[PDB]
């Protein structure tokens, strides 16, 4: 026979011409029976065909083909401790994926691959099978079913040749656990290669730190029982003796810092050898040379051991190289923020000799700025340059601020409008902008605050504030309580240190009052102001224009801007009357937050947060009641109703205005009041002191993808507000609101979330210490700072 044309039939996917030209006996040659057999073999060699049958007639051949592709889908079942994605990766690495050839030869290869994976994750006894579904189409999907074997358990960790230290004491530092105590099970007992290597390194480091310079791990054997249930691990140790560090010797290119290096390498006599201190000395020399510009020094320790005296001499070689310079400083990831916003926090300058301390200071300032979720730095060498580096800062911007608005109809406050635009980094310009506005049947409140944190290049800040707050207790009849206030505040701040700042500003406030229900404290203040309104009726009015000199001091050394784990922040805020104002008083408020990390990973943090306040009048007057302090709620004492902690009003018997007898009134003469009244109406006090003690724990069920966006803690709150001008000698039958001893206490669970809507705070609290007249609020919700 010869070949002229091939009539393939059933050739589903591969080209007919490609199949024609694949066979080495191409068109235009003689064809024997062995040539036809070789043609069948070569067609089978493609790996796509499971059946090849050829019929011959002279110069023409026809081939019948059946197709092995495709895999329609890959599914996994039976897994209970592993996901499916690493299994799919293992299949893809094995050469099997969706859309390719489903060769029946590779089924056992898949079985062995899954068996080897479970061998590698310590579940050797796993049993695995494959199932394929016969679809009518040429595509067929597969279903992997496997019974995961019982995990091979660690049965004994043994150490041979240890004599100075107890075996269990040596084991106690290993990540692999010999046994788990049943009354405080906090872990499990499993084998893994990297954990075993880390435990061996921990054992080496422990023996080296306890003075055994010539310590050696002779051999290690891991063995498993014939039933595949237990694993035995043993380590052989020749520990040697303890070696005393006779002294150090520094030699090399010290670059003129020999005195500081020698102070770094100070050794007291009789000190035992220890590799942690050797490494600490090496790293300290590296840091010392780096902060002078020597970015890449070579430091190697070459100890010499004298076995006769059991002493070691710690020779160390230092080569500082050359001083490095910063060619450029680059910022990556600032999609919204200006370049200057990040660059003005820098302490390293472009076109100057490098300082690693300066780079770290810039990173810390960027972290304290609070605009970025993560801040990372990279000092990379300039290619083709021996003594120049590029400093690159890579940041991930955080969703600073929140924008709110709301509309209501026919509700408790009638038709209602509200809107709030809080934004710490306005459009990436660094400006802090805060807009708040409400309009309901009772309040028409607007407030605008805009602050530039860098009014000059040195960090001087300029800021302002406008507010208008008009309150009416009733929409009609004009004779109910009215409290209209407006005013302006301008502030100036400047830095005095790397962590300390001072503020100084001028404020003006106008406050107008009318038709206030008579009260002991408020009429005490009104008598102090020289006003003499009557207690028999609600008809009264008052009006003040006040100019205040504002001042402040802020110490801020927090680790970060939004969820700190270290450092403290102390903010003092005060104001004093400028002469010529109607009210004469002073006011001072003190904030404190201290973060103490217990675990080196900074996942467990103790936060001690206190807030103090005080204010009083000057020259015989008293501090206005609009400057009072209030406590309770998310900000100060969680678990209590907001602003309800503190002094409560004591009313006088008076002819109430806008009286309608089907409602409840505070002690009207026409309702029948004859004497003064105890109430639960919070009015605040001139003195305030709250404290809290938070214990921050990692969120148990949130993965590392969103772990930095959520914080949960267990808190304990204290706080009290009292009125230092109360006179219990006159009002003996009423509670002593001058007493600061009425500390209100609470405990509970708090959860904070950096939501895309803004900072959200959840808190459930139990006010276990509570006085009469206090309103509790177990579940509390707050949006923002």
């Amino acid at each position: 026979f010869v070949v002229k044309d091939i009539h393939f039939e059933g050739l589903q996917r591969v080209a007919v011409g490609a199949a024609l030209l694949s066979m080495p006996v191409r068109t235009g040659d003689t064809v024997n029976d062995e040539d036809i057999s070789n043609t069948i073999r070569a067609l089978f060699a493609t790996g796509n065909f499971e059946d090849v049958r050829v019929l011959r007639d002279g110069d023409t051949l026809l081939v019948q083909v059946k197709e092995r592709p495709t895999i329609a889908s890959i599914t996994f079942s039976g897994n209970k401790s592993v996901k499916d994605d690493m299994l799919k990766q293992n299949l893809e690495a094995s050469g099997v994926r969706v859309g390719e050839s489903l060769d029946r030869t590779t089924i056992a290869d898949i079985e062995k691959g899954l068996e080897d994976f479970y061998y590698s994750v310590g579940k050797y006894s796993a049993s695995v099978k494959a199932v394929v579904t016969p679809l009518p189409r040429n595509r067929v999907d597969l279903k992997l079913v496997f019974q995961e074997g019982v995990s091979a358990e660690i049965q004994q960790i043994n150490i041979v040749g240890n004599h100075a230290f107890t075996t269990d004491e040596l084991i106690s530092h290993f990540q692999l656990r010999d046994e788990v105590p049943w009354w405080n099970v906090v872990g499990d007992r499993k084998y893994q290669k990297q954990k075993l290597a880390g435990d061996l390194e921990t054992l080496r480091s422990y023996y080296l730190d306890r003075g055994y310079a010539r310590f050696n791990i002779d051999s290690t054997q891991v063995s498993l029982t014939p039933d595949k249930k237990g694993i035995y691990v043993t380590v052989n140790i020749t520990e040697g003796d303890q070696y005393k560090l006779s002294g150090v010797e520094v030699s090399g290119n010290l670059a003129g810092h020999s005195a500081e290096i020698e102070q770094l390498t100070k050794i007291e006599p009789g000190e035992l050898y220890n590799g942690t201190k050797v490494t600490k000395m090496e790293d300290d020399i590296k840091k010392l040379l780096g902060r002078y510009g020597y970015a890449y020094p070579r430091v190697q320790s070459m100890p010499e051991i004298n076995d006769a005296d059991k002493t070691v001499k710690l020779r160390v070689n230092v080569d500082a190289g050359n001083r490095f310079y910063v060619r450029k400083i680059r910022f990556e990831g600032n999609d919204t923020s200006k370049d200057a916003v990040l660059r003005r926090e820098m302490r390293q300058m472009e076109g100057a000799w490098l300082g690693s301390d300066l780079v770290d200071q810039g990173k810390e300032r960027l972290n304290r700025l609070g605009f970025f979720e993560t801040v990372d730095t990279d000092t990379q060498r300039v290619p083709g340059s021996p003594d120049q580096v590029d400093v690159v800062y890579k940041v991930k911007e955080r969703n600073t601020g929140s924008f709110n608005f709301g509309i209501g109809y026919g509700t408790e406050s009638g038709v209602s409008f509200q809107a709030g635009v809080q934004q710490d980094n306005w459009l990436g310009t660094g400006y802090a902008v805060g807009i708040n506005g409400t309009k309901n049947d009772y309040q028409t409140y607007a407030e605008l605050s805009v602050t530039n944190p860098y009014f000059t290049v040195d960090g001087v800040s300029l800021g302002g504030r406008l507010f208008y707050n008009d309150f009416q207790a009733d929409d009609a009849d004009l004779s109910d309580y009215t409290n209209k206030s407006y005013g302006t505040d301008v502030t100036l701040g400047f830095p005095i240190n790397e962590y300390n700042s001072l503020r100084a500003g001028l404020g003006y406030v106008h406050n107008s009052l009318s038709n206030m229900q008579p009260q002991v404290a408020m009429w005490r203040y009104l008598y102090s102001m020289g006003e003499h309104p009557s207690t028999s009726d609600q008809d009264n009015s008052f009006k003040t224009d006040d100019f205040t000199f504002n001042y402040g001091w802020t110490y801020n050394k927090l680790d970060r801007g939004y969820f700190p784990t270290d450092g403290s922040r102390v903010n003092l805020t005060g104001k004093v009357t400028i002469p010529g104002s109607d009210n004469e008083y002073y006011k001072v408020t003190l904030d404190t937050a201290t973060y103490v990390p217990i675990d080196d990973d900074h996942k467990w943090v103790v936060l001690g947060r206190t807030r103090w306040g005080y204010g009083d009048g000057l020259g015989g007057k008293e501090m206005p009641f609009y400057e009072n302090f209030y406590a309770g709620g998310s900000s100060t004492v969680r678990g209590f109703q907001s602003n309800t902690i503190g002094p409560k009003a004591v009313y006088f018997p008076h002819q109430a205005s806008n009286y309608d007898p089907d409602y409840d009134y505070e002690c009207a003469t026409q309702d029948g009041a004859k004497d003064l009244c105890k109430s639960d109406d919070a009015v605040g006090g001139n003195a305030m002191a709250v404290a809290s003690l938070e214990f921050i724990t990692p969120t148990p069920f949130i993965s590392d993808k969103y772990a930095n966006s959520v914080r949960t803690s267990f808190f304990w709150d204290m706080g009290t507000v009292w009125d230092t001008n109360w006179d219990s000698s006159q009002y003996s039958g009423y509670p002593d609101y001058s007493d600061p001893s009425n500390i209100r206490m609470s405990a509970g669970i708090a959860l904070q979330w950096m939501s895309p809507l803004g900072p959200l705070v959840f808190s459930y609290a139990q006010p276990f210490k509570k006085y009469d007249g206090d309103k509790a609020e177990q579940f509390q919700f707050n949006i923002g700072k």
Binding site: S402, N404, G406, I407, G408, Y409, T411, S416, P756
Partner: peptide
């Protein structure tokens, strides 16, 4: 994101 109940509407700008 926004919610409405008892004829009161509040909306939060997200992102």
């Amino acid at each position: 994101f926004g919610t409405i109940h008892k004829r009161r509407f509040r909306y939060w700008f997200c992102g």
